[PDB]
């Protein structure tokens, strides 16, 4: 019946303000100086990156800005048919590896990153030692669409996602005191992922 579209107060406040300016989006876009060499930021669209079709390779690229406070939201656009076997979206410290040999959910694989595998609907963090957690929590009878929002609350130390205008709930906790960057892990040849910062709330 009626799906719930209620969202936490602060997210409502932020989303009530006008979207961030082009200059602000660019300030928080993919960093061409902090990427896997198998990936490159599109010359004609600094908000989108492209992955060379390298075999047995998992590649990542970080956003230009590391966040330490405030509520921040950004939109990720990842064509569904361009995800392959492992497509993870999340955040990480500046130390997270941007590349690995073979195909896997690199983001969320060590204690340096936190990610949501869009194909497995699972949350990963320190994956080597910790088991993944289903998300969103199943209750009925879930596919992640082409676009959705990521919400990092550094004041509370949480990461959450909003799909189809629906708040999916807190995915990770314990991020307080860190400096986190937006990050993605991909393995599909020629995939293009777009990240557009929506806004930050200093509340």
């Amino acid at each position: 019946l009626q799906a719930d579209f209620v969202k936490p107060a602060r997210i409502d406040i932020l989303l009530d303000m006008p979207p961030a300016s082009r200059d602000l989006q660019l300030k928080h876009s993919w960093n061409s100086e902090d990427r896997s060499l198998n990936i490159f930021v599109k010359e004609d669209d600094k908000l989108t990156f492209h992955r060379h079709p390298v075999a047995q390779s998992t590649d990542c690229i970080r956003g230009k800005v590391g966040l330490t406070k405030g509520l921040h939201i950004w939109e990720i656009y990842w064509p569904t048919r361009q995800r392959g076997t492992h497509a993870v979206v999340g955040v990480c410290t500046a130390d997270a590896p941007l590349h690995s040999v073979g195909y896997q959910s690199l983001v969320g694989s060590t204690e340096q990153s936190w990610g949501w595998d869009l194909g497995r609907n699972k949350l990963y963090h320190d994956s080597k030692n910790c088991a993944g957690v289903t998300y969103p929590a199943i209750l009925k009878n879930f596919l992640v669409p082409d676009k959705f929002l990521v919400a990092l609350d550094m004041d509370e130390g949480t990461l959450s996602f909003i799909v189809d205008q629906q708040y999916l709930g807190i995915a990770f906790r314990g991020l307080r005191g860190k400096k986190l960057y937006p990050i993605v892990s991909a393995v599909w040849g020629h995939c293009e992922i777009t990240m557009r910062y929506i806004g930050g709330l200093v509340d």
Binding site: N38, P53, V54, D59, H99, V187, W188, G189, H190
Partner: peptide, 15 residues
Amino acid sequence: DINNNNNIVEDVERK
């Protein structure tokens, strides 16, 4: 292959 990649491409990140 499965993830739409091919072995002809040079993996600059590995090298």
